[PDB]
Amino acid sequence: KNAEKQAMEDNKSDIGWGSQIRSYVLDDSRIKDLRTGVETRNTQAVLDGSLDQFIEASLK
RNA sequence: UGCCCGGUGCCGGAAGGUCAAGGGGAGGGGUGCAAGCCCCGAACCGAAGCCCCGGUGAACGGCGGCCGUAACUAUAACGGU
Ligand SMILES: [Mg+2]
Ligand SMILES: [Mg+2]
Ligand SMILES: [Mg+2]
Ligand SMILES: [Mg+2]
Ligand SMILES: [Mg+2]
Ligand SMILES: [Mg+2]
Ligand SMILES: [Mg+2]
Ligand SMILES: [Mg+2]
Ligand SMILES: [Mg+2]
Ligand SMILES: [Mg+2]
Ligand SMILES: [Mg+2]
Ligand SMILES: [Mg+2]
Ligand SMILES: [Mg+2]
Ligand SMILES: [Mg+2]
Ligand SMILES: [Mg+2]
Ligand SMILES: [Mg+2]
Ligand SMILES: [Mg+2]
Ligand SMILES: [Mg+2]
Ligand SMILES: [Mg+2]
Ligand SMILES: [Mg+2]
Ligand SMILES: [Mg+2]
């Protein structure tokens, strides 16, 4: 079980520079999902929970 | 060649507590007609030892447990008890 866990951990990104999926450039009000990829402009509405947008389009 | 002198040992301590014989003799008893004779007997004085106060490990010896915590993981330098 631990062996399968370490397989996950070492295959689990790094939370680092250039390892990412979103911009919250709140200095020009975008939140971009670089993967499908959409561009909502109503930023502090995403933090409210409008994730449906990205999710529904990211399930392709 | 570390840390622990609380227990044991040894060392030191004219205080204090306890402490035997002995000293003392408040008081009581037996007997005698009596002087007397004889027997218990409190306070208090009275050593070492022990208690008590310290020291001492190349003296006898003894040198822990639980819980949480770091780059998604393991561990825990760190903390709590
Ligand atoms: Mg607001
Ligand atoms: Mg000792
Ligand atoms: Mg000792
Ligand atoms: Mg000590
Ligand atoms: Mg012994
Ligand atoms: Mg002595
Ligand atoms: Mg004195
Ligand atoms: Mg004395
Ligand atoms: Mg006497
Ligand atoms: Mg006497
Ligand atoms: Mg006498
Ligand atoms: Mg008398
Ligand atoms: Mg009589
Ligand atoms: Mg008489
Ligand atoms: Mg003495
Ligand atoms: Mg030693
Ligand atoms: Mg020595
Ligand atoms: Mg011992
Ligand atoms: Mg020894
Ligand atoms: Mg952790
Ligand atoms: Mg973690």
UniProtKB/Swiss-Prot annotation:
Q: What else is known?
A: This provides a mechanism for the protein to regulate its own production.
Q: What does this protein do?
A: Peptide chain release factor 2 directs the termination of translation in response to the peptide chain termination codons UGA and UAA. Acts as a peptidyl-tRNA hydrolase. In the presence of truncated mRNA in the 70S ribosome, ArfA and RF2 interact such that the GGQ peptide hydrolysis motif of RF2 rises into the peptidyl-transferase center (PTC) and releases the ribosome. Recruited by ArfA to rescue stalled ribosomes in the absence of a normal stop codon. A TnaC-stalled ribosome binds RF2, but the active GGQ motif is prevented from engaging with the PTC by TnaC.
Places the protein is found: Cytoplasm
Q: How does it assemble?
A: Interacts with the ribosome. Recruited to stalled ribosomes by ArfA, in the presence of truncated mRNA, ArfA influences RF2 conformation so RF2 can hydrolyze the peptidyl-tRNA bond. Biotinylated tnaC mRNA can be detected in a stalled 70S ribosome-RF2-TnaC-tRNA(Pro) complex.
* Positions spanned in the full protein: 303 to 362 of 365
Species the sequence originates in: Escherichia coli (strain K12)
Span-the-membrane segments of this chain are none
> What name has this protein been given in UniProt?
Peptide chain release factor RF2
How is the polypeptide modified once translated?
Methylated by PrmC. Methylation increases the termination efficiency of RF2. Is absent when the factor is overproduced.
**Protein family per UniProt:** Belongs to the prokaryotic/mitochondrial release factor family.
